[PDB]
Design a protein around this nucleic acid. Structure first.
Ligand SMILES: [Mg+2]
Lengths: 17, 81, 611, 49, 152, 76, 63
RNA sequence: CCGGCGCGCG
């Protein structure tokens, strides 16, 4: 039954502007 | 909901797998939002309604309905056996 | 698809004295159970707190306490009292005693592996018989063979006097011995491969030559089969004679304690002597403890009642396997008398307030606390005990969508337990649908049912999607419908669909009815008492010919010269014409057939429209 | 399950089967085609007990 | 490997005899024949692309003949019969006969070992494969000893 | 179509040459011949027979007279 | 956990009052452990082993 | 909170 078959770049690097 | 349950099983090769998948989805529902279920909203009914709605067939959410004719708070309907 | 492999196993094996020590390590030495006055566990006794673990978790035999390792004075551990259910002890037997299962049960394993008649081994273990030449891996100098029943006169006085005492006893247990010790020595020095080869060669000799010429062969096949299994496993044939006796944990024996006392009663007597009779008494104490009733007369107590051994408590219909393991009593279950409810839906049942509030108690507590109407669990339980009017609203709310399992007593097939949606009904009885009574084999003359609540989401999903009655309309035996109308409903349908009185039962004399546009007009006329349930009438039919009737030609055809002709059958009239393609149909029927057809049609159409 | 076993005959002795051993029918026939080591057996009817 | 095969079949690509043989190459040395036999049962009663080949039978036989405990001669005999019944689609190689000679030697089924050694002779290498470089108690030496002891 | 053995589906054509044949009676001449052949083939493979091995084969030839084999066993 | 699993009966009483999903027991109930001790009293050992399908490691279940 | 004996219900 139901038991069958076992059931960070790009940051701190932005454009300074 | 009985008609919906029969309809969902027309696309399932194995019904035990269907039951297991429904139980797993209900478990995910309860784990994510525990407080929303157990009262007027049941997780398994919500899963069934969502699976019916995913086919494009509109159903009330979790088959949750109440009685508009209850005569105020405290009054409980007495079933006529 | 690759199967989700699961490799789980369990195996039994005959145990070793070293494993018994590892279980106990812790030896029970005294037969005292409790103090007669204080009712405290006697030290070194059958209930010793140092050996088995602390009663009243976290306290010693003295009375000290610590927060949940060993004490100093009494040496009791600081653990939970759970250990008293699992910690074993052992009894250090002075003399080895054989296991009753492997000596007295038929066919005897010890007898076949040693290859001696069973009566000989029984005499050696029980009577005062001594076995000659018990071992082979050590040299001897005597020509005594077999098991001499009579004591050897020379061996009693002459040889002990000539060989003195110390060295004589040093080499004593190598030519003559007795009891289970001799058997264990014979088992320990066995060469299994030699056993296999000798058995095979003897089998071939017997074959190359008719009842016992075959029975001896079957012994040889049995013995070499038995000998092979010891080689490939880790079992030792000498473990069939016990050197230590494991002791059941006290919490599993809060009769058995009496048998444990006798082993200590007779083993501690034997060690005081260190005599043959007391060795046998220890052996019989172990046999009664392990398996009573195999030795002919089973040992009784003072009340002339047979003792109950471990074999008795593990075997039989009331034993551990067939009573404790294959069936269990469960929580969240109820029971009451069942009454019929004809207004119920096919997927619904009625639960009494008391059974429902007991079964769903934790869910009612959660409902109370969740909407801030209860401060804690204790306050919620107190509110539930007081039968406050708001407890029932929460119960009715939490019972929605949570199925229950009903079950009648003689569950003969799988439809003996089914799942329903519970609703709150007044009274103290379970309301049951009438169409599910045949599956339960239930009638309302005193029958009762048990109710069970699935707790986890998986169990609720299983109950809702596999066990509900609307998906179990067919019986697995042959595939016939199980929820078919019976008795009163069948009589009602039979009366409804029993048509007009016909022939001589309708008219007194040989005959040498209203026409309705639609079935609603006929039913309305029936409501206004214009017609009876079985009075004939003609109904205009505007569908295809779909009336079951005998395949017969018209009784009479009325052909008009203008072209129209009327074909008159037994149950309908058909008007046709040659000029036109018109075709009118009138069905001769009653209000009952119309009502049955309309009932089924409206059921189908309403179910379709509701979805 | 009643008719799924065979009985190794009393004269068929080898290191694969022993006489009187209760073996499956499919196993007996598969070893029959693969070995000629006195694989001698006869069909036995077993009760449900 | 098992996790990746499960994920591959979850993604929609079912395992074939190649992946099953790769898995069996490790299961055959675990000392527990039941793992390899479970994999073999998965293969045998499955689809056409999952059906066992000579390598699969070799892996399962090797798993059974080098078991830690209990007797496996009946299991190897039944596997040999199953492989024989599959002759239209599977045929043996040198490793099959080497494993069968080793098995029937260690269990003293000498005549079957002689038959399979006659079959093994026709392959180059042959007895060198059976020797196993001295490992697994040198099955070639055991075969020679078994031949000598019975006067064959 | 269900009657086939491992020999006839794996191409064991040599199998029928070792079956349905009357076995050869043992004789001391045959035994000493096989002993000589086996000793030679074991020597060829790197296996050195012991002194006791040669003595046993020689005594077998003495039991049933075979002088024609004496000249070759002793030199080996 | 409705009959005899002592540890899992107490967790079910807790989860259902908070509504936070019931997990599988995965351990043996007290009826099986009771049987093992009785079989130990007959000098018989009954062990439950789990063989991993990943690395074929044999794991001894606590019983 | 353990077992026997007796009486019942479906
Ligand atoms: Mg009744």
């Amino acid at each position: 039954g139901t038991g069958f078959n076992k059931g960070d770049i790009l940051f701190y690097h932005r454009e300074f502007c | 909901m009985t008609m919906d349950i029969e309809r969902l099983l027309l696309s399932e090769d194995n019904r035990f797998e269907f039951v297991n998948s429904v139980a797993a989805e209900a478990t995910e529902y309860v784990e994510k939002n525990r407080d929303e279920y157990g009262g007027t909203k049941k997780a398994i009914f919500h899963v069934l309604s969502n699976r019916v709605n995913d086919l494009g067939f509109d159903r009330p959410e979790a088959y949750a309905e109440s009685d508009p004719y209850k005569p105020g708070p405290g009054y409980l309907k007495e079933y006529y056996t | 698809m690759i199967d989700r492999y699961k490799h789980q196993q369990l195996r039994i094996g005959l145990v070793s004295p070293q494993q018994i020590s590892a279980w106990a390590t812790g030896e029970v030495t005294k037969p005292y159970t409790f103090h007669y006055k204080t009712n405290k566990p006697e030290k070194d006794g059958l209930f010793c707190e140092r050996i088995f673990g602390p009663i009243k978790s976290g306290i010693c035999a003295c009375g000290n306490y610590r927060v949940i390792k060993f004490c100093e004075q009494c040496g009791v551990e600081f653990v939970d009292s759970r250990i008293r259910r699992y910690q074993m002890g052992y009894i250090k037997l002075t003399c080895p005693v054989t296991h009753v299962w492997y000596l007295k049960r038929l066919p005897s394993y010890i007898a076949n592996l040693l290859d001696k008649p069973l009566k000989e081994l029984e005499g050696l273990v029980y009577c005062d018989f001594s076995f000659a030449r018990p071992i082979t891996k050590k040299p001897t100098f005597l020509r005594l063979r077999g098991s001499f029943e009579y004591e050897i006169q020379s061996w009693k006085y002459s040889i002990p006097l000539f060989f003195t005492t110390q060295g004589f006893e040093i080499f004593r247990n190598r030519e003559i011995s007795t009891g289970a010790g001799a058997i264990r020595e014979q088992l320990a020095d066995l060469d299994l491969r030699i056993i296999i080869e000798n058995s095979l060669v003897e089998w071939k000799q017997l074959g190359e030559e008719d009842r016992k010429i075959v029975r001896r062969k079957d012994f040889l096949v049995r013995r070499m089969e038995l000998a092979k299994h010891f080689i490939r496993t880790n079992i030792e044939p000498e473990w069939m004679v016990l050197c230590l006796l494991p002791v059941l944990p006290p919490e599993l024996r809060p009769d058995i304690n009496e048998l444990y006392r006798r082993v200590i009663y007779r083993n501690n007597t034997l060690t005081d002597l260190l005599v043959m009779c007391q060795e046998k008494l220890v052996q019989e104490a172990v046999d009664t403890l392990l398996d009573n009733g195999i030795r002919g007369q089973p040992m009784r107590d003072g009340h002339n009642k047979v003792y109950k051994s471990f074999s008795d408590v593990i075997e039989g219909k009331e034993g551990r396997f067939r009573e404790t393991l294959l069936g269990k009593r469960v929580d969240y279950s109820g029971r009451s008398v069942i009454v019929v409810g004809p207004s119920l839906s096919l997927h619904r049942c009625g639960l009494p307030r008391e059974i429902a509030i007991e079964l769903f108690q934790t869910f009612v507590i959660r409902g109370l606390i969740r909407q801030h109407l209860a401060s804690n669990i204790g306050v919620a339980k107190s509110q539930i005990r007081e039968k406050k009017p708001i407890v029932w609203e929460i119960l009715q709310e939490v019972m929605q969508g949570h199925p229950v399992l009903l079950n009648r007593a003689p569950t003969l097939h799988r439809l003996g337990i089914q799942s329903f949606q519970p609703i709150l009904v007044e009274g103290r009885t379970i309301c049951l649908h009438p169409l599910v009574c045949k599956g339960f084999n239930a009638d309302f003359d005193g029958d009762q049912m048990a109710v069970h609540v699935p707790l986890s989401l998986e169990a609720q999903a299983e109950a809702r999607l596999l066990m509900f009655s609307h998906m179990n309309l067919l019986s697995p035996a042959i595939g016939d419908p199980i929820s078919v109308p019976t008795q009163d409903m069948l009589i009602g349908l039979y009366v409804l669909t029993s048509g007009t009185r016909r022939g001589i039962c309708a008219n007194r004399y040989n005959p040498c009815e209203p026409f309705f546009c639609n079935s609603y007009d006929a039913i309305g006329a029936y409501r206004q008492k214009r017609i009876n349930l079985d009075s004939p009438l003609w109904l205009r039919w505007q569908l295809d010919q779909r009336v079951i009737a005998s395949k017969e030609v018209p009784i009479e055809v009325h052909y008009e010269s203008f072209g129209n002709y009327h074909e008159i059958y037994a149950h309908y009239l058909i008007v046709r014409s040659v000029k036109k393609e018109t075709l009118y149909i009138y069905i001769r029927t009653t209000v009952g057939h119309i009502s049955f057809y309309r009932e089924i049609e409206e059921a189908i159409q309403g179910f379709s429209q509701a979805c | 399950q009643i008719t799924s076993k065979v009985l190794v005959s009393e004269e068929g002795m080898s290191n694969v089967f022993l006489p009187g051993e209760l073996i499956g029918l499919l196993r007996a026939e598969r070893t029959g085609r693969a070995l000629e080591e006195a694989i001698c057996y006869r069909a036995v009817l077993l009760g449900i007990t | 490997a098992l996790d990746i095969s499960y994920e591959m079949e979850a993604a929609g690509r079912f395992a074939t005899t190649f992946h099953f043989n790769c898995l069996l190459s490790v299961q055959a040395t675990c000392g527990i024949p039941e793992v390899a036999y479970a994999t073999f049962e998965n293969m045998e009663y499955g689809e056409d692309f999952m059906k066992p080949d000579t390598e699969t039978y070799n892996w399962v036989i090797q798993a059974y003949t080098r078991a830690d405990s209990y007797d496996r001669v009946q299991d190897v005999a039944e596997l040999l019969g199953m492989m024989v019944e599959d002759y239209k689609r599977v045929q043996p190689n040198v490793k099959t006969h080497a494993l069968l000679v080793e098995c029937f030697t260690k269990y003293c089924v000498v005549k079957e070992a002689i038959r399979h050694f006659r079959a093994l002779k026709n392959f180059e290498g042959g007895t060198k494969v059976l020797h196993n470089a001295g490992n697994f108690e040198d099955p070639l030496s055991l075969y020679l000893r078994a031949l000598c002891r019975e006067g064959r | 179509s269900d009657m086939y053995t491992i020999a006839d589906v794996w191409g064991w054509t040599w199998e029928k040459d070792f079956k349905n044949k009357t076995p050869r009676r043992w004789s001391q001449e045959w035994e000493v011949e096989l002993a000589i052949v086996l000793m030679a083939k074991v020597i060829e493979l790197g296996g050195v027979p012991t002194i006791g091995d040669c003595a046993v084969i020689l005594r077998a030839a003495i039991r049933a007279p075979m002088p024609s084999s004496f000249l070759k066993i002793l030199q080996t | 956990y409705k009959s005899d699993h002592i540890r899992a009966r107490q967790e079910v009483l807790g989860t259902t009052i908070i509504g936070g999903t019931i997990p599988k027991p995965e351990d043996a109930p007290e009826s099986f452990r009771l049987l093992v001790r009785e079989l130990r009293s007959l000098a018989l050992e009954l062990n439950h082993f789990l063989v991993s399908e990943k690395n074929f490691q044999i794991n001894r279940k606590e019983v």
